[PDB]
Amino acid sequence: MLSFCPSCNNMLLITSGDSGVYTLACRSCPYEFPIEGIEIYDRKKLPRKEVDDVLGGGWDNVDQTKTQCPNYDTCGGESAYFFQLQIRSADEPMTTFYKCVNCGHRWKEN
Amino acid sequence: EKAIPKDQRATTPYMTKYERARILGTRALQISMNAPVFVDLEGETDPLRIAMKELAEKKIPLVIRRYLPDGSFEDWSVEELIV
Amino acid sequence: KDMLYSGITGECLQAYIFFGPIYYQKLKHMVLDKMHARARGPRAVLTRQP
Amino acid sequence: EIALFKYRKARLEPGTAIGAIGAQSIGEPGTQMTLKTFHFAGVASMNVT
Amino acid sequence: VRYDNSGCLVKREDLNKAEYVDQYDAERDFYHSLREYINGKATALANL
Amino acid sequence: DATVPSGRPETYIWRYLPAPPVCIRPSVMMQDSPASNEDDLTVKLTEI
Amino acid sequence: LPDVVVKGLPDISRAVINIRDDGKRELLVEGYGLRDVMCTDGVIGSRT
Amino acid sequence: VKTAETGYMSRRLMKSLEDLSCQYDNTVRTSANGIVQFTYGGDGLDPLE
Amino acid sequence: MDQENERNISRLWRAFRTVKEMVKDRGYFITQEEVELPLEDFKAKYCDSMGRPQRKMMSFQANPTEESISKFPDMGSLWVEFCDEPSVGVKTMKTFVIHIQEKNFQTGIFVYQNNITPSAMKLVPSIPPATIETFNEAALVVNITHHELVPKHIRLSSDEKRELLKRYRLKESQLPRIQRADPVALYLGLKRGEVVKIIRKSETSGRYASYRICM
DNA sequence: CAAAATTTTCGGAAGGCATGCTCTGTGGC
DNA sequence: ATTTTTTTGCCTTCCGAAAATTTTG
RNA sequence: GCCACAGAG
Ligand SMILES: [Zn+2]
Ligand SMILES: [Zn+2]
């Protein structure tokens, strides 16, 4: 929150006050800005860097299976592209990645 | 009572380089103090070369007392040691 | 590369010798000022060492 | 005979100051070592010391 | 001779186990290698 | 260790200062003055 | 808040996947969490 | 500049390794008669030989 | 769900396998078939119907083998227990100590989940004849004695230790030392004064034996 | 249950050491 | 009685302060 | 004598 008092260009701070309601108040000059029914937010959009789909491109020319997608209330697709991958230890089951062909929303299981 | 008998000797029968050096130094110090020699010295004067000649055909009167770390010692005749 | 006869045996050297003037400098470090030998001599008053 | 003689004379002779020998045999290559830049198995972003 | 940690003789069935490794094994290893080398030479002659 | 007479805590507090022999704090020979310079230990001893 | 760690080990600076000479892939990291790496599933703890 | 650090490294290594020696029972021991190695290098062979 | 349940079950299963291997390596009677207990049988045996880990069920007792009691005549049965609390205080530690003392166990292996308070670490030597060893589930996910760097440690009996000291003609204070709270010493449960023989594999010579003493 | 005593953990500062090994000269206090 | 620095790294011990844990009421 | 730089390998 970076806002400055229009009267004297000094930094504005938020205090609780006696009433318990927050206001944008200036500690230098007699100025306040109540926010009852008014929204204030200082959004800090963090930078987003491009990421490669580490599982993308693997659902091409592979066998299909008859598994219902979890979003059954929105669609009823049955055929899904499935394949097997070992991403765990050798003494526990080798996981399956399978994606619906109609709605996307990829998901995996063990 | 700490002497290991001659039959039960376990240390290697080869004379180490340090034993050779100490034996030569001791014999040269003895000869430099007018000790008799047991070789036919051919005009040699330096005690160290006389000591080397004495060791050459094993005519030197000393023995080596090797201390094992426990405390028992082991006596080896210099003429017995293989060089 | 000149062809030099050796002064010891007189025969021609079997390789041509790179022969010519080079500027050489005599440096100030001479062995007359560097040689030293002690045997016994003065000793320090505190530690009684040379 | 030759093999047995070479083996029996290759033993560490008692009384050897082997610790000092090892200390020198480790320190002296440190003198001979020049400082170079290395990397860990073909990737240039490591620069392992 | 190979002695166990207790201090008695070791049976032939378990001479090469880990807990019976002594200080002389290197010597034994040397002898084995020596024999192997000689055996190799003999094998070569046999092949000829 | 309290088995010896000198093994007490009060030994580690300065009560008697042993003045060192002058053979280990000797007076330096003269350089340009008839007087002789003294070691720092002797001067500190006089100050004490 | 945007500097908190939500996943991964707190001491691992970075991680790379190296393809070795024989073609198999190994995962080599910069950090001080050896136990957490060798306890992580998918990583052989007996060869790390 | 490498000699300045290498000299200190050699001094530390020797002041830590000077006391060891090979005893007459082929066990490497410190000056206080404590074993560091039961046989030198596992086989008791001199690197020099 | 997946992350909170299956990963925890797999970690607990691997910790159980490591604990079984540790108890087997001490000479206690554990059959070979019990240490490769697969995840399916572990779920069918020690897990709840809805899919929860029942750590009170997986606590058990171990008895020495005839070979171990032949070599070590003073060895008795142990009781290994897994705690359900995330952080153990002094109440549950005192309860475990009271259980160990009441059932007359020579030693007891305690496996906490997240952390142990420092007030309980000073309560472990409370029993004079018995000893208590505390382990972490995270520290038991992977076995350290199966690592390629760690060589074979084999603890020696009193007779074997005396034979070694007579063979090399030395007092026990002159041997190389291994600390207690060392990971391998904790794994094998060495007490003070015990001597362990270590089989080192050097490329120069082959296999050679070294010795260490616990301190 | 939360107030009070005890113990542990965590920092920043305060100390210390290193900053080769030998050797040859001068100049000023 | 205005007022520069002049290598760089590594290491242990100390010592309040705050946090964590147990212990009294 | 103490400091101070200057060089040699
Ligand atoms: Zn204002
Ligand atoms: Zn779908």
Q: Would you list the domain boundaries of chain I?
A: 2-142, 143-215
Token couple for E21: 């490794």
Can you give the distance from the CA of residue I132 to the C1' of nucleotide K23 in angstroms?
Answer: 25
Instruction: Note whether H31 and H19 are within 8 A (CB).
Output: yes
Which residue ranges make up each domain of chain B?
1-83
Query: By residue range, what is the domain housing residue A14?
Result: 1-47
Question: C-alpha dihedral over H36, H39, H40, H42, to 10 degrees?
Answer: -110
State how far residue B14 is from chain D, nearest Cα, in angstroms: 9
F33 touches strand L (CB under 7 A): no
- Residue of B22, I169, I195 whose CA lies nearest to H23: I169
> Rounded to whole angstroms, how far apart are CA atoms I76 and I186?
18
**Partner G contacted by A89 (CB < 8 A):** yes
- Residue of A84, A85, I52 whose CA lies nearest to G42: A85
C29 touches strand L (CB under 7 A): yes
C12: helix, coil or strand?
Answer: strand
- Residue of B48, A46, B30, H30 whose CA lies nearest to D20: H30
Task: Pick out the nucleotide with least CA–C1' distance to C45.
Answer: L1
* E-only strand ranges, chain A: 12-15, 23-26, 32-34, 64-66, 79-84, 96-100, 104-109
> Rounded to whole angstroms, how far apart are CA atoms A53 and A102?
19
- Residue of A71, A73, A61 whose CA lies nearest to A107: A71
- The one-character DSSP state at I11 is H
Distance of CA A23 to the CA centre of its chain: 30
Range B6-30 burial, b when 16+ CB lie within 10 A, else e? eeeeebbeebbeebeeebbeebbeb
Token couple for A90: 């050798």
Non-local (6+) Cβ contacts of B17 within 8 A are D13
Instruction: Note whether I207 and I200 are within 8 A (CB).
Output: yes
> Rounded to whole angstroms, how far apart are CA atoms E1 and E3?
6
Non-local (6+) Cβ contacts of I140 within 8 A are I14, I15, I18, I19, I111
Non-local (6+) Cβ contacts of E24 within 8 A are E2
Amino acid letter, F44: K
Can you give the distance from the CA of residue G13 to the C1' of nucleotide J10 in angstroms?
Answer: 23
> Rounded to whole angstroms, how far apart are CA atoms D31 and D48?
20
Q: What angle do CA D28, D32, D33 make, to 5 degrees?
A: 115
Contact H/E (≥3 CB pairs under 8 Å): yes
> Rounded to whole angstroms, how far apart are CA atoms H49 and H40?
14
- The one-character DSSP state at I134 is E
Secondary structure (H, E, C), chain F: CCCCCCCCHHHHCCCCCCCCCCCCCCCCCCCCCCCCCCCHHHHHHHHC
- Residue of B12, I157, B72 whose CA lies nearest to E7: I157
> Rounded to whole angstroms, how far apart are CA atoms I98 and I65?
26
> Rounded to whole angstroms, how far apart are CA atoms I43 and I38?
9
The CATH architecture annotation of domain I2-142 reads 3-Layer(aba) Sandwich (3.40)
| Structural element, H or E, at residue D1 | none
Protein CB footprint (7 Å) on chain K nucleotides:
21-23
| Rg, C-alpha atoms of chain A | 27
- Residue of I146, I154, I46 whose CA lies nearest to G45: I146
A99 labelled binding-site residue: no
Backbone φ and ψ for E7, nearest 5 degrees, come out as: 125, 15
Backbone φ and ψ for E39, nearest 5 degrees, come out as: -60, -40
- Residue of I93, I156, I100, I155 whose CA lies nearest to I129: I100
Distance of CA B54 to the CA centre of its chain: 10
Count of beta carbons in the 10 Å neighbourhood of residue E17? 13
- Residue of B57, B61, B67, B74 whose CA lies nearest to B23: B61
B22: helix, coil or strand?
Answer: helix
Q: What angle do CA I174, D10, B53 make, to 5 degrees?
A: 105
Dihedral sign, CA of A85, A86, A87, A88?
A: positive
Q: Which CATH superfamily is domain B1-83 in?
A: RNA polymerase subunit, RPB6/omega (3.90.940.10)
A100 labelled binding-site residue: yes
A91 tagged catalytic: yes
**Beta carbons of I160 and E26 less than 8 Å apart:** no
| Rg, C-alpha atoms of chain I | 19
Residues paired with I109 in a beta bridge = I80, I133
- Residue of I137, I107, I135 whose CA lies nearest to I121: I135
Instruction: Note whether B50 and B41 are within 8 A (CB).
Output: yes
Non-local (6+) Cβ contacts of A69 within 8 A are A75, A77, A80, A100, A102, A103, A105
Token couple for A45: 């959009």
| Rg, C-alpha atoms of chain D | 19
Task: Pick out the nucleotide with least CA–C1' distance to I91.
Answer: K22
Token couple for A10: 């000094």
Task: Pick out the nucleotide with least CA–C1' distance to C29.
Answer: L8
State how far the alpha carbon of I183 is from the alpha carbons of G46, I139, I179, in Å: 15, 10, 9
> Rounded to whole angstroms, how far apart are CA atoms B52 and B58?
10
Look up the CATH number of domain I143-215: 3.90.940.20
| Rg, C-alpha atoms of chain C | 24
A108: helix, coil or strand?
Answer: strand
> Rounded to whole angstroms, how far apart are CA atoms B48 and I94?
79
**Beta carbons of G47 and I148 less than 8 Å apart:** yes
Count of beta carbons in the 10 Å neighbourhood of residue D41? 12
Place of tokens 């500049």: H1
Range I131-165 burial, b when 16+ CB lie within 10 A, else e? bbbbbebebbbbbbbebeeebbbbbbbeebbebbb
> Rounded to whole angstroms, how far apart are CA atoms D43 and B83?
57
